[PDB]
Symmetry: C3
Subunit: 95 residues, 3 copies
């Protein structure tokens, strides 16, 4: 599994959220952040199976891109395990 941390322009949040739901993303965590003068940005985090990382990255790039400076970045970070708090399920069962 991998954590995908994407920092995007605020006005792109609805579009990116909808696109991710479209490709099957079950849950996401969003945080208001600032970056670059510090400009407001939005962080989106999802944790997905290894085989689904590329489709997610492609979807975010295509939906969040404007071609202008400050579009943001995406980091792929390893995750050794995920646990669903409601049930105690782990791994594939927790995503």
């Amino acid at each position: 599994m991998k954590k995908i941390e994407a920092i995007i322009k605020p006005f792109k949040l609805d579009e990116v959220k909808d696109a991710l739901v479209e490709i099957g993303i079950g849950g996401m965590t969003v945080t208001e952040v600032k970056g670059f003068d510090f400009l407001p940005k939005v962080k989106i985090e999802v944790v997905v199976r290894d085989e689904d990382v590329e489709k997610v990255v492609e979807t975010i790039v295509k939906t969040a891109q404007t071609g202008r400076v400050g579009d943001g970045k995406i980091f792929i970070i390893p995750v050794e395990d995920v646990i669903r708090i409601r049930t105690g399920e782990r791994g594939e069962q927790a995503i």
Copy 2:
């Protein structure tokens, strides 16, 4: 060492914070976030020794669980090093 990133329901913050302090957690970073309509959630991050990860995960699951949808998730992420800003101590000495 491992980073433990837990996303929980807001009203569970005091209970989870107290439980973690109870099991010996020395420090934690909390962020107001949103997730799933975006509902308010709270992110808690702690970095602990490998041998202490399971006890922390169990404590968070037991204290943050309600059995209802949206209880959240916990991600275990590898950390290659930790540095204490005040002293420059690293590793076990920085936790």
Copy 3:
């Protein structure tokens, strides 16, 4: 590449931001957080080449330190890839 996550005292943000720009950091993501009673802190995230991690860590420690309790911590987390949303560039080209 590595993600560097630093949690510092709020009043140190301008100084740390300037120092990082001074040593060549191209972009950073800042989040208002709380930690330890929860006191306000600021999280700074940068992703850099492996050979630049130590210089960044040293710069943050030197600029953010006060010698007093609560100065914060720095976590070094592996990053398997970085993607620049504007162009689709990855790796060294995306930093």
